[PDB]
């Protein structure tokens, strides 16, 4: 038989997407360039506009629902005491820093800096849409064609506050705050409870708390180095943002397609052909643009289903690893969680 | 030969219709800082859409930007409760909309009075703002949604909390298991029992 | 011409070609066509 | 309500013309020649088939969601009713 | 079986005419002029 005589505390990062950028598309402004006859001919296609709007609204609501189910699992907003001593464990890299303008931790700052969001959904007061920014920002050109990105319900500050409350509850109450009321407990006793849960006697921890705290601090320090070593650590979120931006770019680019017409510009067909002979081209243009919109909506629905599955998985991971001590092997990372 | 074109005076910084050598559109004109080449006439960005144009009478370059617009979201309580509503101009500044106008980060909100206090989010507005309908005298009030009740754990080096009692509770969890079975007669739906319609539909294959 | 080009006709093959010759009035030339109705289309000559 | 509204929208899409002169097939069959009515019947069939395909895609997405929810509910049953799951917040808030 | 049936259905959908005179591309290309065959090629491309 083989029995280990020592151990090495390690920290493994697991990134799971929770939500994505909302999307609201106005069919009348997208398919038709504010034309009256085009808008009148669009009404002959039924309630496809209503179906698309309903699907987009459902996706937008489901994103906030997933965010609430993932981050708002706590009842109260717990804070850390002014004394930041926890028996030798250093949580300064994960606790929020009051000296920063935003109440995020250095690790959270690195995470936000590695990800380059395309559109945040804030107010563009007709100033960042023109000038030299127009030649480098594709979001304004998308918004000009009805592709309006809506900001999420919970802002970055609220998500940071929820994360800080989760962290404070975890470090000051163990798993008691998840079940019922928060019960204060020293962090070494919480580690002893975790060791008893993984099947290790608490004396092994009470005799090597110093080495365990040193290994934990070294792992927390190396986490930042591993995250800053390559941008592939956040590759999941990066690919999600890139897929959203690429779908928006493809949807705004499909307007330049002719779909068998003489030209992609509606005004050119309106000025070069008579109404009875230009209606046959406007019909093809509207059909092609509506097919593009339906394909985009189907892709967004599939991606939203995938994001919902990932968000349910992330909420399960939260409830089982942060709010508790899951015994499932390889669920909360490899090794005895 | 096309005859006289009869151009008009140039107007900038206003929501007007512009025409430059056949290119038509709708948007404002602003003095640009670009470096258009002497032979280039039209300006286009990455999204394959026009964003600038050169004037034919003077070689100065002007940016093309459509007039302000945005979605109009209406916030209203139940009809059986009240009839007053609020209007949200998402993505539009309040100065571009034209007593209680308020500017949120998700858009300009009109018809809701902002308060410093916070409650639970009743109607999600956006950017952390939520609206409720309360007697403050009933009105739609806008406020920042509260994340939860303020609480602080009394952590210490040798202090522990242990419950002396317990309360058995029951929580209901609703999960769907199935839905209505949908069966659609494709031929009868597409064609109203017509023979020629069915013969033409058969040409579309096995859809 | 239905289904075939009036010009690209010298580069194809056919199983059997049947020429139908008949004289009709000038106002009923629109009646000799698939799906059309009228006196000639119902009692004289009908195209499938 | 989603199923009912989807059925209502699918039965309402028949009112659309999709560029044709009328949404009623009998009218097109009555006041148009077969060679002149085929060009409208084709567009009507195309529009109705696109509506049906969109409805089938929405129903497949809803069926995938229902399958996920049913697997979740079966796991809940097997772990909370037929047993005692130790997973936190899986069988309700608190010690299950 | 579902994968194989999807592949077979996709390879068999080429048999459909989608309102065209023929499901064969070369037949339409050789039987009609380009301006007259464009309206059939458009329908075939849309259906496929």
UniProtKB/Swiss-Prot annotation, chain D:
Outcome of mutating residue 75 to I: In strain: Gamma/P.1
Intrachain S-S bonds: 80-91
Coiled-coil stretches: 1-41
Origin species: Severe acute respiratory syndrome coronavirus 2 (2019-nCoV)
Residues of the full protein shown: 953 to 1048 of 1273
Job description of the protein: Subunit of the fusion protein that is processed upon entry into the host cell. Mediates fusion of the virion and cellular membranes by functioning as a class I viral fusion protein. Contains a viral fusion peptide that is unmasked after S2 cleavage. This cleavage can occur at the cell membrane by host TMPRSS2 or during endocytosis by host CSTL. In either case, this triggers an extensive and irreversible conformational change that leads to fusion of the viral envelope with the cellular cytoplasmic membrane, releasing viral genomic RNA into the host cell cytoplasm.
The protein's name: Spike protein S2'
From Swiss-Prot, chain E:
Annotated coiled-coil segments of the chain: 1-41
Function: Subunit of the fusion protein that is processed upon entry into the host cell. Mediates fusion of the virion and cellular membranes by functioning as a class I viral fusion protein. Contains a viral fusion peptide that is unmasked after S2 cleavage. This cleavage can occur at the cell membrane by host TMPRSS2 or during endocytosis by host CSTL. In either case, this triggers an extensive and irreversible conformational change that leads to fusion of the viral envelope with the cellular cytoplasmic membrane, releasing viral genomic RNA into the host cell cytoplasm.
Protein's UniProt name: Spike protein S2'
Organism the protein comes from: Severe acute respiratory syndrome coronavirus 2
Gene name per UniProt: S
Parent-protein residues present: 953 to 1000 of 1273
